[PDB]
Amino acid sequence: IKRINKIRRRLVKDSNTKKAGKTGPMKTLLVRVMTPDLRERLENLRKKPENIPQPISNTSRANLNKLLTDYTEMKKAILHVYWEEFQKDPVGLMSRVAQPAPKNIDQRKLIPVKSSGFACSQCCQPLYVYKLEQVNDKGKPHTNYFGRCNVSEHERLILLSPHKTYSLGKFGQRALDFYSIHVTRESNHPVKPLEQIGGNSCASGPVGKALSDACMGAVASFLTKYQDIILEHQKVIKKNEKRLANLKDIASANGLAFPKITLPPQPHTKEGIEAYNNVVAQIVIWVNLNLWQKLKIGRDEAKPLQRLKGFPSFPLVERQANEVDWWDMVCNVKKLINEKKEDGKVFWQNLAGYKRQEALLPYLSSEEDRKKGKKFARYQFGDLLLHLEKKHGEDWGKVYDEAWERIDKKVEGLSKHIKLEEERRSEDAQSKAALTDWLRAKASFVIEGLKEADKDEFCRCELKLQKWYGDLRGKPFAIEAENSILDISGFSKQYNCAFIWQKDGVKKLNLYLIINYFKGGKLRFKKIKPEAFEANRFYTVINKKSGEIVPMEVNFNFDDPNLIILPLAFGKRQGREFIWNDLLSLETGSLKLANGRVIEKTLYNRRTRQDEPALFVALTFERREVLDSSNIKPMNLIGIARGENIPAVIALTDPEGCPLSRFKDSLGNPTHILRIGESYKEKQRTIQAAKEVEQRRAGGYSRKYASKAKNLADDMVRNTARDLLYYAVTQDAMLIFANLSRGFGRQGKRTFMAERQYTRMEDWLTAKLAYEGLPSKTYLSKTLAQYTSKTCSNCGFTITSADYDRVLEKLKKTATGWMTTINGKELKVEGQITYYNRYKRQNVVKDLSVELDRLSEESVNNDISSWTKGRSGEALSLLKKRFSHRPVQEKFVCLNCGFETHAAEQAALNIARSWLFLRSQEYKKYQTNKTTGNTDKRAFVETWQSFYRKKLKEVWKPAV
DNA sequence: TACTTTGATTTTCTGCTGCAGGATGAAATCCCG
DNA sequence: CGGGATTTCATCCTGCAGCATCCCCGA
RNA sequence: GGCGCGUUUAUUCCAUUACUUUGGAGCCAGUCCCAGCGACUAUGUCGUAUGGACGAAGCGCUUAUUUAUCGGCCGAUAAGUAAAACGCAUCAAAGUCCUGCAGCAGAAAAUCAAA
Fold this sequence. Notes:
Layout: H1 4-13, E1 17-19, E2 26-33, H2 36-43, H3 58-88, H4 90-96, E3 111-112, E4 116-120, E5 125-135, E6 141-148, E7 158-162, E8 166-167, H5 179-182, H6 193-196, H7 204-253, H8 270-292, H9 326-339, H10 341-349, H11 354-359, H12 367-371, H13 377-392, H14 396-424, H15 429-447, H16 455-474, E9 484-488, E10 497-504, E11 508-509, E12 512-515, E13 524-527, E14 538-543, E15 549-555, E16 564-566, E17 568-569, H17 572-579, E18 591-605, E19 610-623, E20 625-627, E21 636-642, E22 648-653, E23 663-664, E24 670-671, E25 673-676, H18 680-698, H19 708-731, E26 733-738, H20 758-771, E27 780-783, H21 801-810, E28 812-814, E29 817-822, E30 825-828, E31 832-837, E32 842-847, H22 848-857, H23 869-882, E33 891-893, E34 900-902, H24 903-917, H25 922-930, H26 937-954
Parallel strand pairs: 21-26, 26-27
Antiparallel strand pairs: 1-20, 2-17, 2-19, 3-5, 4-5, 5-6, 6-7, 7-8, 9-18, 10-11, 10-12, 10-14, 12-16, 13-15, 14-15, 18-19, 21-22, 22-25, 23-24, 28-29, 29-30, 31-32, 33-34
Helix pairs in contact: 3-4, 3-7, 9-15, 13-14, 14-15, 15-16, 18-19, 19-20
The chain binds three DNA and RNA strands through helix 1, strand 2, helix 2, helix 7 and helix 8.
């Protein structure tokens, strides 16, 4: 039976247990706080439970709300202070936040710099460089670099990273002493969040220590991203200089006038980035308008400049609160439309004959628009104008007035309907979208007469109307809520937080979470004997740094007006995982509670169809006892192929490489191929289609679809990981993946991020293995991905570009038509090719022989070598498309022997066979020969094909 | 021969992945009943 | 004088190996 | 699309704790009232269920007052109400979180240009 927990139990029973290292694996339990609505849900059951729990009391709710608001305000204040500090002096701050080396690395410094890369801003003295050479565990020598000062107060060892000229290398959350600056009463800093925001009501210790981490973590992350990106920006600047020079030369060679603008130096703020990107945009606009379009020059010969991307913003303080009132903007648009009425009337009425047809060309819909069931407001207004012209003749003076009156009446009706709708309870997004579209159409109609008179005022009007159109269409779907976070630094007597339980029976437990963050509250811990439990008394466990577990009795008062008491809501599965686990018991110390958080975030309520705030509790657990991996030795192989249409296709093989038919398909016949994840893409496309329909109708989709794709993707990833682990454990096999880079995936036009699940599957399988204490190499391995999907599994021949080039070279004409040979096999050049005509938006079918004859109609003796570049290019494009090894995505055809099969299954088998290849002796001789500087892929392909053919002859008997 | 696609830039809103920072207890003073 | 409450401090171990592989192919 | 009942995901032993999701099965989808869109006899008419508003959303099992049939519900058959309690439709899986940025993609609109 395929259960993840069953596989975990089998893994546990098969090996010994050992204590974890300094830090073990971590896992988070996310539960909900028992609120009145959950109780109401519990009271509507057909079979009512015997004991319905009490919800969170009113006093706790008030305390929690106040504390959450105060915590958010203190975070904002501290972040604003450090934003000002960074904006004043970057280098000083990022030198202050750099993490010092441990005060234990006191090996003998050997060599100073052969100097002043940075400076300790505390004393404004340079940090001199000092090296230290050592050997790693793998034998590769490594030199670390450190910065030291002659100040005794600043006699530290700040880590450094060399570049080809030094960087810092690490930013810590605790390097800067936050408590002594902002929390302690002796400090003279003008900003003291606990003393000012909270009104001296919160305990200094816990709240201050939580703020320390919460703010300095974000600051350190921003500093790391900034220092990282400031180097690739330099590389891009240097690269753009050469391209600008080359394009200037090309423009000069063709006798064109290049704009006289200069690229600014490398910027270090957001305004400089915007200026540089504006210059790049102007250059690219000119290049496209004059070089690619008019002269038909290839993009490769005239390469564009590149924008600067990835510059971070300061945390939480640079957010733009684009808060605009909707009806006010509607009124402003109406006002400015009413301003220009006379100018539009004058332009339209006094217009000439033939200029009128071109004046209203953008107002006339196309045939495709008329066919697709619905038209934009512009074309509808154009149809109205045409009918009015037919009605009144050529007297456009009356036409203008009638059109204006009709548009006003329609807009007034829409406005009245929208106001009545929003008065009661309801939102009609379609009506708002229609009103915005009709306002846009009226604005265009009025202002189109100023496109040639005053381009500055016309540009101002266009900018205003464009920004207001964007804002009006985007506001009704703008989210205004944000999560609220309350942190718990740790679970020890210091931080005044407890996770308490009554000992019902011997194993049964009651459950509360207690927070004491207000002055005056009482929460007392008392040490007791290990087995001195009593009824109606709350107990907990305290974990000591030395490995000791101290059971304590926690006593307090329920009616205390300062405490926060939270009852939790969870399921059997979560309880067996964390609270009352059979093996990982937290009373024994095998499981430890690390820290926690109280979260307020939005849940979707379908009863009211709205997002509403809700309270969650997250508790992080650390595993202290893990397994021993020294005895696991898989024997067989499972090659796994990843993709989009099918998330996983797996093939099972013996140690020799021969297929093993042990899986059962739907029909029950033995097989060696399994598919995991089918019909996932179809569901994702269905969700996307629903989203697109709503987006076209109203400009955005409802909150019902907010998290559907992510939930589906998470479900697929977790279930696929379970399936892979189950097969690997039960078949005694090692899993083999392709060596795809992190973040690998297609970045095209109709691509979606929910369909890029390669690294996610990798990470989930690795983490699931890691929680038990085993390394990734125990059950998972990677191999080179080259030529795995391009090798025939029946003959061992791999197709390459050079083969296609040589086939083009040999192709000629006999009395029967075009002919060629590959590896002594004759090819009868015939058959039709159908291509997806994008301009026609259809499928166009052509005949290869006829196309080849046409290409030979302008040529004599059919000499391919005598053709131009473009003609030969079309020739090999046609031959490649007709002789492609992958005519259809899921179908593979071998060109050398005519073998046909499924591409994914063959590639899955070839992945395992390649993993076998990498540890053969042919690869050894190839590696030895490659040391002579011969960097040729051709020899690698030779070795791969030779090994594959040898093994096919020897032991891999092909299917007959 | 031409209508209809495509190239570039700008405005607004949403979601999903990717990568940084993390997953604090021990000990020393100080004050107050 | 003991017990809360507040303040100060400090911790770390990892690769390597070749241009393709869910891209495809295009008026 | 909407409305509800809820099972299985630990072998004696572990909170039918109640959470958040992915599946299976049950029941119900009309009205131009207001808008949107399309065709025109065109400052309106007609049509169209695109969006709001209204309306729809299991079946049995046992208990006692009234009527219809005999001596005038006591004995049974149908109709009308709240509750107690069980059964069938009807069933399998998964969960490692927080903060902060960035990058891609989706959807419209505006302008210039080419073929």
